[PDB]
Amino acid sequence: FSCNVDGGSSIGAGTTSVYVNLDPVIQPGQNLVVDLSQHISCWNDYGGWYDTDHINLVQGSAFAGSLQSYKGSLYWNNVTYPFPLTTNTNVLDIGDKTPMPLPLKLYITPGVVIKAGEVIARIHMYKIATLGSGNPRNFTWNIISNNSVVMP
Incomplete structure (x- = not known):
């Protein structure tokens, strides 16, 4: 099983930075939307569903630093x-070589923010x-x- 970030080289395990661009001004009340489907892709290395991969997101995944007071x-x-995730998510099954x-999307409801x-x-x-x-x-x-996100 492999993944990549913005069409980079393949990743089999470990920690990877995913750099995203956010709306630089946000209204009070309103969500910031991070669309990680435009950043991360993954695939099965053998293909054809012969040895399907079971992928889930894990309990404890969370905001970092000062974003921890924000809902999401x-x-x-x-x-x-x-x-933050208090449980594991459902499983996504990956069997294709493509x-x-x-x-995956993340919604964040928060001067510099x-x-x-x-x-x-x-x-x-x-x-x-x-x-x-x-x-x-x-x-x-x-x-x-x-980039920075600001409230007006």
């Missing part, structure tokens, strides 16, 4: 969860395969803003 949600594979956008270069969130993803022990792997996606 996380959309994963057709289900909306409260963020890189698939991760069905996000700093350029600030870790916004730490999303732990788990993979296990179907055959044998399953060759379980852990991924962490550190989401980081390219």
Whole structure:
């Protein structure tokens, strides 16, 4: 099983930065939307569903730093969860060789409110395969803003 970030080289496990661009001014009341499906893609290395990969997001995935007082949600594979995650999410099954956008979005309801270069969130993803022990792997996606977000 493999993933990549913005069409970069493939990743089999570990921590990777995912740099995102946010709306630089946000109204009070309103969500910021981070669409990670436009950043992360993943695929099965053998293909054809012979040894399908089971992927879920893991309990404890959370905002970082001063974003921890903000409410949030996380959309994963057709289900909306409260963020930070207090449970694991449903499982997404990956069997195709064609890189698939991760069905993953993050909603954030907050002067400067996000700093350029600030870790916004730490999303732990788990993979296990179907055959044998399953060759379980852990991924962490550190989401980081390219730019400041301000309230007017």
